[PDB]
What we know:
By secondary structure, chain A is an alpha+beta fold. Chain A has helices spanning about 15-30, 55-60, 70-85, 90-105, 110-130, 145-155, 165-175, 260-275, 295-300, 310-320, 380-400, 410-425, 435-445, 445-455, 460-475, 495-500, 505-520, and strands at about 10, 40-45, 50-55, 180, 185, 195-200, 205-210, 210-215, 225-230, 230-235, 285, 305, 345-355, 360-365, 370-375, 405-410, 500-505, 530. Chain A has a domain at about 210-400: GroEL (3-Layer(bba) Sandwich).
Amino acid sequence: GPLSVFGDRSTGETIRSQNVMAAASIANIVKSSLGPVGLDKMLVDDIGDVTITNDGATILKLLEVEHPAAKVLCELADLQDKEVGDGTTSVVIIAAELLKNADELVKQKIHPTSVISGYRLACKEAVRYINENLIVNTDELGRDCLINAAKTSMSSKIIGINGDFFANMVVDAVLAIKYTDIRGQPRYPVNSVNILKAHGRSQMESMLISGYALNCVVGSQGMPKRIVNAKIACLDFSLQKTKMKLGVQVVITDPEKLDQIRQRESDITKERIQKILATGANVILTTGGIDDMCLKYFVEAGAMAVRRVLKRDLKRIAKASGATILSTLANLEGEETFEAAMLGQAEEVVQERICDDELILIKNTKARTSASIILRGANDFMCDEMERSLHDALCVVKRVLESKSVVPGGGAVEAALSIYLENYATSMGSREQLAIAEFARSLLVIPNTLAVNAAQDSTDLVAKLRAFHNEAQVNPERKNLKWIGLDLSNGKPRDNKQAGVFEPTIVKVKSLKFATEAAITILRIDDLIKLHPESKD
Amino acid sequence: MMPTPVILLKEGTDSSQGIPQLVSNISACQVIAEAVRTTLGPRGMDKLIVDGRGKATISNDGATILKLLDVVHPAAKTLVDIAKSQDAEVGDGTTSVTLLAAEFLKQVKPYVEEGLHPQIIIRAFRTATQLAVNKIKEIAVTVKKADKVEQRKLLEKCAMTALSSKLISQQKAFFAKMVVDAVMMLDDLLQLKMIGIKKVQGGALEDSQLVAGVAFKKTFSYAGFEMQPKKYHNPKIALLNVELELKAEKDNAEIRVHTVEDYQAIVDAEWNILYDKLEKIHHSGAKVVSSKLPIGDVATQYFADRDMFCAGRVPEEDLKRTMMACGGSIQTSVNALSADVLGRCQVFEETQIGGERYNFFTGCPKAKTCTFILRGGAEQFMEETERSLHDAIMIVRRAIKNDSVVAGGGAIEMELSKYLRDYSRTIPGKQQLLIGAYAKALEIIPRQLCDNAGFDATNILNKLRARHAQGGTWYGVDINNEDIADNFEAFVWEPAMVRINALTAASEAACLIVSVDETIKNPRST
Amino acid sequence: TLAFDEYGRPFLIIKDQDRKSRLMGLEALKSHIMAAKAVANTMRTSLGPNGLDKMMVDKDGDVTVTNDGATILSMMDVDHQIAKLMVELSKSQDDEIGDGTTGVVVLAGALLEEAEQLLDRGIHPIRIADGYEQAARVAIEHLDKISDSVLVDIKDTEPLIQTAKTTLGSKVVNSCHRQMAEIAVNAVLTVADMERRDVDFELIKVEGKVGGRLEDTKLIKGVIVDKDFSHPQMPKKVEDAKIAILTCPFEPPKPKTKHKLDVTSVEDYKALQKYEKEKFEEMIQQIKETGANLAICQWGFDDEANHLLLQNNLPAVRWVGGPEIELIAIATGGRIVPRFSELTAEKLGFAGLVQEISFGTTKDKMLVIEQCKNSRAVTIFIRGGNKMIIEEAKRSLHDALCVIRNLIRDNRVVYGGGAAEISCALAVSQEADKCPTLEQYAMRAFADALEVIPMALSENSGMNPIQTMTEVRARQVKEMNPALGIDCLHKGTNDMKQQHVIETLIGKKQQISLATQMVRMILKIDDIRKPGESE
Ligand SMILES: Nc1ncnc2c1ncn2[C@@H]1O[C@H](COP(=O)(O)OP(=O)(O)O)[C@@H](O)[C@H]1O
Ligand SMILES: Nc1ncnc2c1ncn2[C@@H]1O[C@H](COP(=O)(O)OP(=O)(O)O)[C@@H](O)[C@H]1O
Ligand SMILES: Nc1ncnc2c1ncn2[C@@H]1O[C@H](COP(=O)(O)OP(=O)(O)O)[C@@H](O)[C@H]1O
Ligand SMILES: [Mg+2]
């Protein structure tokens, strides 16, 4: 008679109501961590680890989910870090409210393919309207655009101070790693900034190290820990005793030739260490291993040798100091040449005190003048929060300098799109106009969440918010009310042009493209079959 | 991990707080509204609920379905009590009260998640309800030519729509004619105990009938009932409350005798006590005897020899209907029997309807009661037919004392959305998002008339909002044709107090769900 | 999600909702058809004269072989609420008419099978149910076309015997197909009131005793009770019985209340002996003064009263049941007397050969009443080879007693053997085109389901269903439609008027009416709220 599957089958409006409650179970979590009045959470594990964070990606990655519609919204937050980097609480609330308003349409016996086709006409028109209603590029504002866009990202986190201490350190970090490319591409690789953590003084003592901050120790306590006018030798091979390979064995037939082979394992080893040290090299960085026999040659000659450094850290030092990453001997059948003209340069390599640990600093690197940020917090829970908040702040200034276009934040984009799409649904709307009209109400949840978390008036402040944006579209008298946002500290609509509340363009363009595409896949689960777990057979 | 005291809070109780509590109450009312959602409209199906004992009850009434779900949710019990009060006040407002009260919470469900302290929602719900119950009274039509054939036609149209959405398809013209004729035979009290609805298994719905008199089920008799033939052209009924047995003992009598000459005189006196009571029933014309107390083998054979009929162990609910049918009086003592206490009928026979025997009375013109015998093919079929009969009786019971009727279907629920949206555009403040949300919540009654049979319900609401804003105010949803139609001209009528008590009970239930902010449950459940 | 909210709170609506079962879907209507078709496919093989019986085993281990559709569905342990409505459907046909209890379940399963293909085309289930009411109305009006009977209950019993042979032809009484058919005709006409057209089945006592054969079943005009002569030397044959029916035990009169009679002297104790000695001589003389030679008593006898019966030549039975003596006073024309002092010659019953008959080696000795005088109560004595053939014959002959009762209620007949179902299927197909607006597909599904009952007779008779039905249905359109059906041995031609296959009009009128209304209550249901496990 029925289906003889050994799992479970649920059809109809059961799964159509379960996917909305699965998406609302995720959105109601992250609704309390949006905007400058948002608050952080606690993520406690079974082993006892506590993670205090408010970013939309760190919470949903550590949180376990079971529903298939819940894994779509959790993987939607992971894509926002790679594509944009701060846009990762706002996408989850929009994509869940896109399913909440579309559930009210399919309960009115409206076909979901008209809602899918109605959402594509509203998503492509939202990108078209936001690209024709921008204020200015990065020429008029200058450095004031980079600082004000950085403070908007920090307002939802622990580094949202009233001053410009953390804002100036981010702009000075991205501007110091300007790496040009072919065909006129000024790239800004923000992954080259080594963000370090140390439980020390307050947040106002966060050092901006112009150069690189290596997270390693010297090793042997007989080397000079401060070298002025240093020459960095970046190399990746273990400075240990000469061990033969698997194909080579030592089969001796004469007992007199025994001790000459035993001394040869250290003579070939020390032959490399004398030709890399006679060329003026004082700092040697190694990703392999330097044993206790080879540490004597640096104490005797007065050189610094750092062992077991990361491979991702050696590439950031050799590119910034002009050093060449050498793995072995080379240069056309040469015995030991080392190409001594390709040594790195540094002004000062100094191991400072980082509150009961050792940290090596390189000052200005003499070739590229890179930057590294050492964070200072109260405990380890604040340092993990300060690292995530700084990494999201580095991604904001990266997209502004690459794509010179900013949009007003604080719900100013979602207020203008809530009224333009209602007029867009009336012109060319015959049967898909109800999906475009619900696309505007789903976008209004971003200024609605700012009024809930601020404990302000909800149905009056957003009603006063769209009152200025309606007059900016139907009354062409140059009212300039396209930048009207929210003042959550006062509870009144303010102008985000003069207040300095700036967000990048692709933090809302890619947010509206990812949330609309995720809402289509969850809208097509009218039939769902769940099989039994095959564990013990 | 937070609460670890030495002395706990109360015992172990959990309590939600704030905005997650209120959405938990609104979404709970949406689940219990699905059990009355598919039972609306003439194209609405019924539901079958089986309990733990295995008893099946198939019905579509809101007062029958919601009482068998065994709902233990605190907020969802509010929608069950308004379905019970609608059956107690009106009788046919049941599925519409539960579903409309759930829409009052779902239309404010995006509003309660974003601010909007609920004292503004309670004030807006009470304001829109008082304007809704006043526009019904100002538009409900009435007549000034009653006590004629036109008033009986008004009672028949309200009973056909009350018999709609039931298990009756083509028997609307047959059953609803009997419902109007049932309440017109009653007195000026309209008591529901003055009409017997008895279910006889076997026969179609066309085999049912409305007896002008009464009829009982012919309960357990004794030897002598195959005699006493059932042909009476003008009998008299003796309603009694006495025992006609030889063993009538007062349970405290000790008859101490001394000799054998007086011992036989006691046994002869015990037969003379019973035979003197039978001589009082005799010599008075009372050929039919009815008593709620049992009759032994002695008085059964005495009436068979004197060509008299009797019936013992009659239920007390049937003797009260028998007293108002024949116009007599129940006499406990047989010494005061006369012509003023006996009944009078014309046709009294014992038929064989459905296999079981039934002693029916007919022919009495001064009949203040009636009996509607139901014939069906199943026990659950006749229980639904009895439940559908009570909804048509309680509609026509209230229609006599208040003949103000309105249009059926979604005609009133759509035009109340017109008068409330026009009122919401004339007041400032936050009430434009609440009075207008109250008007959009009333549009689900024409939605469930269409969603149960397709009908393209999105396009049919654009025709309803355009017709009510242009011309008449009684345009609703046609069931046979997939179009809008004037329900007042199509004789789809319902009394005005059906929708007045529906809007009043749904608003007071919706104001109670939004007013509770904490729910504390004690774990002691024994 | 279920049992949890989006805010983390537990979401409990009803009690024990985890162990519940709820189906709305599109398979809730599909589960009702597949549960009802398996009941109709079971009862399809037991239809017609070639219908094979079914063996039913009770919970106590008792085995009853039944063929009638009322007792088959009633003795099942089916815990399915859709199939439980098919049990009450066959019970409602037995309580009202009592002949088509098998055919009303195959017809209801045929209407649901044709509605399954109509459900996949997008038709609403109430629209199919509203289309079946407009289609069954044509079958009622077309069934009243050819209907006539000439029964006068004097000498024209030939339409009454041939009507009962159609009911008894499908049972296991075909060996007594002519003998037992005449028993059920004469048993109804002697007890029926023709002035009121009312038949009382309490006057027809159906008794059974193992032994003999099926041909030894006789219609005893009178009563058959278990004779309990307290004296073993009582005469076992009374030629002319003046029956004295009484309801008082042969004892000194005991009151109904507490007495505690006091004895003081020895003159009072000697008065106790003379009181009882004269009481047993008074209760015996008051019967002999009326001229009676037979006594019936409901209660027991005393040992002192037993020998006084033999001295006065007065046979008497002991410990007769409640409704058993009620049948004696009607069969003999006597009156049931409460006391002994109210005995007279007018309250005596008249009977002829009053005797007891021993059956083989048993000690039952039932009463046989041969001669009577205008009795209104008969007793059928069913004999057989085992208790399986007797309890079935009690159920088979009860269906034969009901079809004679339906002829007194309505003297209109039809012709069975599938002849009325093919003729009614042509009436719905002719009115399906007048007009084919909305319910065209619902009426053609009714006519295709009415042809399942005659094609089930062709399947049980070893023929082909679609080959035989196409030949019979085409012959009713080319000419005026006769009583044209089928049979097992086929009796030569297929004319039901010549083969004397006669069924009642109101029997088939309630087969279409009850199966349509039961289909409407199982099509107008879109949810099931059954629980899970028992505990
Ligand atoms: N000063 C401010 N005034 C008003 N709104 C602000 C201000 N600063 C930040 N916001 C709002 O807070 C929101 C924070 O979003 P966020 O959680 O950072 O997104 P993501 O998770 O993608 O990084 C932004 O959408 C922005 O509109
Ligand atoms: N002939 C008809 N045409 C259109 N709609 C109808 C017709 N008959 C009844 N209805 C609708 O069916 C609905 C039945 O409601 P009902 O379940 O009886 O309410 P309650 O449960 O309060 O008695 C009514 O609201 C009415 O509008
Ligand atoms: N001699 C015959 N020729 C053809 N058909 C017959 C003959 N005798 C009986 N039948 C058919 O056998 C069927 C038996 O139905 P039955 O099972 O007795 O119905 P129910 O269960 O209601 O008593 C009848 O419908 C009748 O048409
Ligand atoms: Mg039969």
